[PDB]
Structures are given as C-alpha cells and as structure tokens.
C-alpha cells in the first residue's frame, strides 16, 4: 500500500475519478494533455506517493502545514506506479524521499480508504473505500524498473541515455 | 404479496431462511449434459445449487432459473455481500429458492 | 534531438492509455447485462 | 407521448409518483414456483416490487417486466441513483411503472 | 451497405441528424401497458423516445429496438458520449433510429 | 476445429484477416427498417459492418450475429484493442466473420 | 447433485479436470456458418473451445453453450482468474464442459 496526504476530501476525490496531477480535470480527461515525464517530475503527469504513513503524513504536514483537516488516501499497488529511486538511478534528484510515483493520477478504484487527519494529527479510523476493487489489486504490484527505464526522461544529452541500463533502453534521440 | 425474503419462504414446503451475510467464495457452471446447473460456495463450508430445469418447472420458473444464474456470476464478479437465501432444504446441494443482499 | 523529449511523452502517454482500457474494463463491466439470445431472435 | 415520468405516470389508473432520489437498499429476488419476483428497499421505509407476470400483462408488457428487474439488479449493485418512481399504488407492495435516474 | 449515420439516416423520410455530444442527463424507463418505451434527455432539452414496439415496425425491428434500449442504458450508466442521432421528426418525442458515439 | 482465428478464416471463401492492433474509434447503430445494423471504424480509416440478418445466413448465424454487436459494444465502451478480424471482403463495408482480442 | 466441480466432471466419460489457476491470453468468437464458437486460451499455450451446437444437445444445454460463451467474455474482460475447468478430451481444441472460479 503507497500513502498520499492531500487536502481535497474524498467526495471531492471520488467526483474526479480520483487523486489527479495538475492538467487532467478527471482521470480519463485527454482534453487537456499533461506533459508527463519521470525526471523532470522529479525534480509533469505524475502524483507522488510514500511507502508509509509516517512518510506520507511527514510530507502532508510541511506542505499543508495549518490546515485544520487533510486525509492521508491509502492507494494500492498496480502497474501505473513507478518506484522513483529505481528508474532513475543515481540521477534521483531526492534518494531519500523513495518516493514511487503513479503515471497519470490514481483512479478511485484503487484507493484502498483513507484517515482523516485533525490539527496535523492522524486519526487512526481508516475509512475503507467500498468502490475499491480487490481482487484486482490484491495481486497487482509495481511496474519493474526494467520497464520504467524507457520512460526515465533524461533529456537527449544527458550522461545517463549512455549507460547502464538507460542506454539499453533509449528512445529516439536520446543518446 | 411478500414484502421480506422470510416472509415470501413462509410459503413453501420445505424451506429454510440462511444468514450468510458474506461475499460467494467459489463459482462453478455447468454445461454438461443434465447437470446443466450452477454450485456457489461460502467460506462457511455452505454449498448452493440453482437446481437443473426440467419439466417440473412451470414455464415461468424456467425463465427465474436463467436470472438467478446471471445474479449469482455477476454478484461473484462484482464480490457483493449476499445477506440470507432461503433454499429446498431437502436437496443436496441446498437448492436456492430466492437470495437477498444489502445495503 | 528534442525528438527524445517528444518520444518520452509519447511513450508515456501509450502506456497511461493502455491503463486506463484496463480500468475500464474493470468498472463498465459491471454494468453490462446479457441477453437472452434465444427469446429475442 | 409524454415526455417525461410524471405525465407518463399521471396517464394512469391508481398511480403516484415517489420522489427518490437515493440508491436502493436491498434488493431480494425470488425464482420460488408462483412468486417469481423482485422486492427493493429504500431508506425512507418503502418497499417496492416489479409484480409476478400473468393476466394483466399484454404480451409486450412481459419484455418490459424483464427489462426493469435487469435495471434494478444493476442499478442496486452499482449504488446507482433512482431519481423517481411511478407506482401502481392499489397493490402490496406497490408495484412499480416506471423510473427515472438523473445525472 | 451504407457506412456513416449520416449515409444511413438519408435513405428514411421524414428522418433528420441531431448532433449532440454530450452523454445521457437522463434516463426514464416504462413497463406501463401500451406505455412500454425508453425517453432520453440532455442538458440542453433535447428530449428522444425508443418508441413503442408495434404495427409500423417490420418483425427484424422488433429485436433491434430492444438492443438500442440496452445500449441507451449502459451509454446512460457509464456516462460515454453521443455523437450523433438520427430520429424520426414526424412524432414527438422524435424517435431514435440510429445512434454513433466516438473516442 | 480451428485453433486460431487466421485457420478459422481460412477455410471460407473470400475472407481476409486484418491484423488492427487497435481500439474502435467510432461506433454506430441502427434500428432503421432493413438497415438494423452496426457499423465500426478504426483510425488507420478503415470501416467494418455486422451484417443485417437476412438470406444467405444460416440459421445458427442468426443468434451468433446478435452475439457479435453486443462483444463489439462493450469492447467499444471498455476501449479493448482488437487484435485481428477476419471479414467477407465481398460486401461493402467489409463484414465480420470472428474477432480476436489478445490479454 | 455433485458439489465440485471435480466430483461433477467424475461423472462424465472423457473427461479431464484441468487446473489453469489464470486468466484467459486469448477470445475469439466467430460467427461464420457451421464456426460459430469461441476459442480461448492461456499464457500456457493451452487451447479451449466451446462447442458449435451440434445436435447432440438437449435444449437446456442449448441455452446454456450460450450462457457459457457470456461467462467467457465477461472473464477475459475482468481479467479474471479461472481456477479450474472440467473438459471433453476427445475433441480438438479440448471442450468446454463446466468452469470453476474461486474468491
């Protein structure tokens, strides 16, 4: 399970298909086009998640440090998530964050529930999400780094498209 | 007429409500020759047929026979809570006379 | 070439797409109900 | 035509319309021998039923009987939002007409 | 054989396109005797019918009417856009003939 | 019997495999007299059409074709690829004889 | 009536019961005269059909190859796992005879 603290509640979450990035309205919105792109979101179509709530709620509370109320959504693994230390090697802008990002948002469906959090505070009641889809994501997990590497986006010159394992795996004009 | 599941199998000889109150474990269907039929599990242990037709069923109950079917696989797809279901108690597997779900 | 940057995004997008089908796959499927083939025909 | 639920429903004979608006609550269907049926539940405390086919039903009304329980057993396990209903009130429980859903 | 909706509906009198693009607001549904029949509505007051099955429809339409009831339900149910319609603008609410949605 | 869809194809004459790789972008239905059809396209600009039942269909096409829109509905809606079709290319649009989808 | 999907497949001759424990790689359907089937196989290289209606079926086995087939392309759509199926070995590709799904 990945854990990501955001202020919108969960009516709101459910009205848009899910967690979105900034440039989709609702999840299956290809009206407005997102530049998605793994090393400068990094640094762009993808939401960030941590691997605990401790993580989750330690980022919840600079960002949205004050704000009376937030929630911290208990998303499941499948294969939209990437683990950011994985694919960008030792180019990770921030090691330490191993952060796993989702391409795309999640949809709703994959949001196992989430705690409401009071005054900064987690409120251990984890609402369960009843539109979550279990026996789909109950064996579902990560996409492998492997498959990752092609999507990187390092620019063209960047030291990276010419070693391991990137230049195994380089577009066009990359490298 | 009935207004609840109990009271429609106060009715019928032979009959019996069951609390399950969980989702269907296993889905087995059948095309095999007589044995055309559907068995449902519970984690309870329970077993459940929707019995075979044949020319004891009232053309009517030919016709409710095809819509539990369709009832039971998508509610095994969709993992919905079945509450109770009230069964022939005198044939194995239980035969399901009529089910219920809530909320 | 910045032709990278355009293969990124494309890629990218090809297997966003490829989710959400399958996300849709998932919740439409529940609301398809099958017909009896033989009493309408 | 009517163009809508509400002259529909006012064209008939023992009708009314129920304001809704919320999702069914249960949902009980029965292939039991001569009550071959579906009872929904809502929160509001009524109960409803599409009635058992027979001799108050032209031969078209039967495909229709058939569409609405497929609508209801989709509507119900989806959560899906019934916007109104249009009962024949002269029965127990009232039997539905029609129903509308809004986005 | 004719391969858009707009080559279709231009073989039919008293037919016309109505080009919508825009998903289902909503959706009323009837099993009222002689009163069988599906109306839609969209935001902006476009109301249709799938009219009644009756002596004006050739036998193949019978069947065809039903499946274009189906698909107005999950279109409705999944929220999926129309693009165009062709209907019958000799009745009101004019009557769907022909259907095309896009992605 | 055949294995495969393009050994399937191959023992009919004047039936040609298209490999599509692709989701459908455009779907169209019709309940027009004589013309209860539905008609598909792809981007590559590619058209294909169910056939209207009628006279040189066997029997057993009959209930299969009815099969066949409702698999290309829902592929539509849930946006499955295609992977190949095999058709009669001596019919305009082209019709389908079997469809395959892959994972 | 047998309770398994093992014990029901035991009282059949020429049978095998096969432990897929997968979802389905492949669905084809096809509606050309005398092919009208489905085939479907696993990322195992394992090949299944189910039957064209030969006459060597009882009506009641009649409605349910068709149910079958529902039950086929609603799996490959969900990406459902199949735990076992009960099938004919004495046919090329294996016979569908009954399936199994569990939790």
């Given at each position: 399970?990945?854990?990501?603290?955001?202020?919108?509640?969960?009516?709101?979450?459910?009205?848009?298909?899910?967690?979105?990035?900034?440039?989709?309205?609702?999840?299956?919105?290809?009206?407005?086009?997102?530049?998605?792109?793994?090393?400068?979101?990094?640094?762009?179509?993808?939401?960030?998640?941590?691997?605990?709530?401790?993580?989750?709620?330690?980022?919840?509370?600079?960002?949205?440090?004050?704000?009376?109320?937030?929630?911290?959504?208990?998303?499941?693994?499948?294969?939209?998530?990437?683990?950011?230390?994985?694919?960008?090697?030792?180019?990770?802008?921030?090691?330490?964050?191993?952060?796993?990002?989702?391409?795309?948002?999640?949809?709703?469906?994959?949001?196992?529930?989430?705690?409401?959090?009071?005054?900064?505070?987690?409120?251990?009641?984890?609402?369960?999400?009843?539109?979550?889809?279990?026996?789909?994501?109950?064996?579902?997990?990560?996409?492998?780094?492997?498959?990752?590497?092609?999507?990187?986006?390092?620019?063209?010159?960047?030291?990276?498209?010419?070693?391991?394992?990137?230049?195994?795996?380089?577009?066009?004009?990359?490298? | 007429?009935?207004?609840?599941?109990?009271?429609?199998?106060?009715?019928?000889?032979?009959?019996?409500?069951?609390?399950?109150?969980?989702?269907i474990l296993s889905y087995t269907e059948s095309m095999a020759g007589k044995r055309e039929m559907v068995i449902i599990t519970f984690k309870s242990?329970?077993?459940?047929?929707?019995?075979?037709?044949?020319?004891?069923?009232?053309?009517?109950?030919?016709?409710?026979?095809?819509?539990?079917?369709?009832?039971?696989?998508?509610?095994?797809?969709?993992?919905?809570?079945?509450?109770?279901?009230?069964?022939?108690?005198?044939?194995?597997?239980?035969?399901?006379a009529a089910i219920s779900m809530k909320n | 070439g910045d032709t990278c940057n355009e293969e990124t995004q494309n890629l990218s997008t090809i297997?966003?797409?490829?989710?959400?089908?399958?996300?849709?796959?998932?919740?439409?499927?529940?609301?398809?109900?099958?017909?009896?083939?033989?009493?309408?025909?």
């Amino acid at each position: 399970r990945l854990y990501k603290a955001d202020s919108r509640p969960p009516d709101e979450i459910k009205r848009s298909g899910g967690l979105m990035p900034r440039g989709h309205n609702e999840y299956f919105d290809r009206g407005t086009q997102m530049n998605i792109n793994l090393y400068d979101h990094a640094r762009d179509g993808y939401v960030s998640t941590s691997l605990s709530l401790r993580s989750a709620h330690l980022a919840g509370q600079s960002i949205l440090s004050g704000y009376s109320t937030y929630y911290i959504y208990v998303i499941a693994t499948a294969p939209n998530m990437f683990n950011v230390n994985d694919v960008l090697g030792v180019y990770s802008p921030h090691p330490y964050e191993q952060e796993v990002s989702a391409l795309g948002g999640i949809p709703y469906s994959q949001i196992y529930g989430w705690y409401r959090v009071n005054f900064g505070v987690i409120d251990e009641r984890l609402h369960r999400n009843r539109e979550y889809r279990d026996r789909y994501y109950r064996n579902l997990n990560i996409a492998p780094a492997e498959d990752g590497y092609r999507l990187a986006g390092f620019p063209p010159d960047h030291q990276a498209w010419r070693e391991e394992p990137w230049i195994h795996h380089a577009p066009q004009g990359c490298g | 007429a009935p207004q609840t599941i109990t009271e429609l199998c106060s009715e019928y000889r032979n009959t019996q409500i069951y609390t399950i109150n969980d989702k269907i474990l296993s889905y087995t269907e059948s095309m095999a020759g007589k044995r055309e039929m559907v068995i449902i599990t519970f984690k309870s242990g329970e077993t459940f047929q929707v019995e075979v037709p044949g020319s004891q069923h009232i053309d009517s109950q030919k016709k409710a026979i095809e819509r539990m079917k369709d009832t039971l696989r998508i509610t095994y797809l969709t993992e919905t809570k079945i509450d109770k279901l009230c069964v022939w108690n005198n044939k194995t597997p239980n035969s399901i006379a009529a089910i219920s779900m809530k909320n | 070439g910045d032709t990278c940057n355009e293969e990124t995004q494309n890629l990218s997008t090809i297997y966003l797409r490829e989710y959400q089908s399958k996300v849709k796959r998932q919740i439409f499927s529940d609301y398809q109900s099958e017909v009896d083939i033989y009493n309408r025909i």
